[PDB]
């Protein structure tokens, strides 16, 4: 099927863009400004807009962190690019923040976060999603908790945004967008291309190494001066490939008691 592709991270943020090669949209009866439906695991849908890219290949689609999280997918998975340019204008929207991001803020959130975000963008939104707004000093994330008509609606110049209410408690099925990833490391371009080539295969698809019958890696030793970002490479790799990062520390092992260490 000419629908399932591989995903990769983005550069120019823009929570509502995906990059596709020119021939792909040409053979998929697609045109500019056409809203598309993306569907992935757990039967989740995210609505986005498509645009051209200079160096995008046919089988690879570039998209940023926020769109990936909504679909509940990770790097190198497969997605459905099923297109449908038919969305009826929403009438009234209800957007509320997450609890553990608006600690001691208050004020009117509508006119300093949402107002410059939806202004002249015509962002297509879907019920249940999460988006991140770069505030004046923090990064506050919101959650579309109700829409009319449900669930597909595009934000129009004439709607009713009800940003009033108590924040929603953080659920259990999320990635906690305010956490580390591959885009949160700089000055380590070459090294992070070696820890990533020798670790993704044993962790992403484990079953292959059983059938092939070869030896996986069993230890990596990062060395350097303190404060250069070593525990952040291990925390970034665990959060994106999908793993169970379990840290054991130096000092508190050496000082428990006698022979109980």
């Amino acid at each position: 099927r000419p629908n399932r592709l591989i995903v990769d991270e983005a550069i120019n943020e823009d929570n509502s863009v995906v990059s596709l090669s020119q021939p792909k949209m040409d053979e998929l009866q697609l045109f500019r400004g056409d809203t598309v439906l993306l569907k992935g695991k757990k039967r989740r849908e995210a609505v986005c807009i498509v645009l051209s890219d200079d160096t995008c290949s046919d089988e690879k689609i570039r998209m940023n962190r926020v769109v990936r999280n909504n679909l509940r997918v990770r790097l190198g998975d497969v997605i459905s690019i099923q297109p449908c340019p038919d969305v009826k204008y929403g009438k009234r929207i209800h957007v509320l923040p997450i609890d553990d991001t608006v600690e001691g803020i208050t004020g009117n959130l509508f006119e300093v976060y949402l107002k410059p975000y939806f202004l002249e963008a015509y962002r297509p939104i879907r019920k249940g999603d999460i988006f991140l707004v770069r505030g004046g000093m923090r990064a506050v994330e919101f959650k579309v908790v109700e829409t009319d008509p449900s669930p597909y609606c595009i934000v129009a110049p004439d709607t009713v945004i009800h940003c009033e209410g108590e924040p929603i408690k953080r659920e259990d099925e999320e990635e906690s967008l305010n956490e580390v990833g591959y885009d949160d490391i700089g000055g380590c371009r070459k090294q992070l291309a070696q820890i990533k080539e020798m670790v993704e295969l044993p962790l992403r698809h484990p079953a292959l190494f059983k059938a092939i019958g070869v030896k996986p890696p069993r230890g990596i030793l990062l060395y350097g001066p303190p404060g250069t970002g070593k525990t952040l490479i291990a925390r970034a790799v665990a959060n994106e490939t999908g793993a169970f990062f379990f840290l054991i520390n130096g000092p508190e092992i050496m000082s428990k008691l006698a022979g109980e260490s």
Binding site: R92, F110, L119, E146, P157, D158, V160, H162, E164, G165
Partner: protein
């Protein structure tokens, strides 16, 4: 702790818990007559005896040879009622008020037909069994237990309570009455028909209303 904690547990739980906890306290000290709360079935068959319609439905003489079993069901109930208010029953207190009444009348008519006296464990496990089938599909593994698979809770709990003690009558009817109501309230309307011909009257809603989403005040101008 005794003050705020008792008022913070859900009102339904806070009164039901105290309903069957403080009564054994009177029994152990023995101020009122312990023999005054039996619910004699043969007496009900001959005379109405308006003295004890519901009175013997909360008195249990917990003590030397009647403890253990009574004590443990308080633990799960306290550990599990708070969950089943949050098991979609928070928005329907009137519905939760109802099947409690329906279950209480269902166990008591069987409690009067055959000659058991203490209908105390049945009301605990019946709602607990109803909680299982209505909140199935989770994995649970406590510290002193095994790694048993999910959706086994209503049957696995049916063994421990049965083998400790006896009186097969109350365990069987309590689970079965929850089973038939499970099909009636939930499965019967979408199976063949026979919709909710037991709707709670508006008077129950008038006593205690439900929870509804409020939209508030809107604000947005041109562009």
């Amino acid at each position: 702790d005794i003050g705020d904690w008792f008022r913070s547990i859900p009102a339904i739980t806070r009164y039901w818990f105290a309903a069957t906890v403080a009564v054994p306290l009177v029994g152990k000290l023995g101020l009122i007559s312990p023999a005054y709360l039996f619910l004699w079935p043969e007496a009900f068959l001959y005379r109405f005896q308006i003295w004890r319609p519901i009175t013997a439905t909360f008195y249990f003489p917990v003590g030397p040879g009647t403890g253990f079993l009574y004590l443990v069901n308080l633990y799960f109930l306290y550990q599990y009622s708070t969950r089943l208010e949050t098991g979609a029953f928070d928005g329907r207190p009137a519905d939760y008020l109802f099947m409690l009444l329906f279950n209480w009348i269902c166990i008591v008519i069987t409690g009067l037909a055959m000659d058991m006296q203490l209908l105390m464990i049945p009301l605990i496990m019946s709602v607990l069994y109803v909680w299982a089938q209505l909140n199935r599909d989770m994995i649970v593994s406590f510290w002193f237990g095994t790694r048993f698979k999910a959706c086994y809770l209503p049957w696995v709990i049916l063994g421990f309570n049965y083998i400790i003690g006896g009186s097969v009558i109350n365990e069987l009817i309590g689970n079965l009455v929850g089973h038939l109501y499970f099909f009636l309230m939930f499965r019967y309307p979408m199976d063949l028909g026979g919709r909710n011909f037991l709707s709670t009257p508006q008077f129950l809603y008038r006593w205690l209303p439900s929870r509804r989403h409020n939209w508030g005040q809107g604000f947005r101008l041109g562009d």
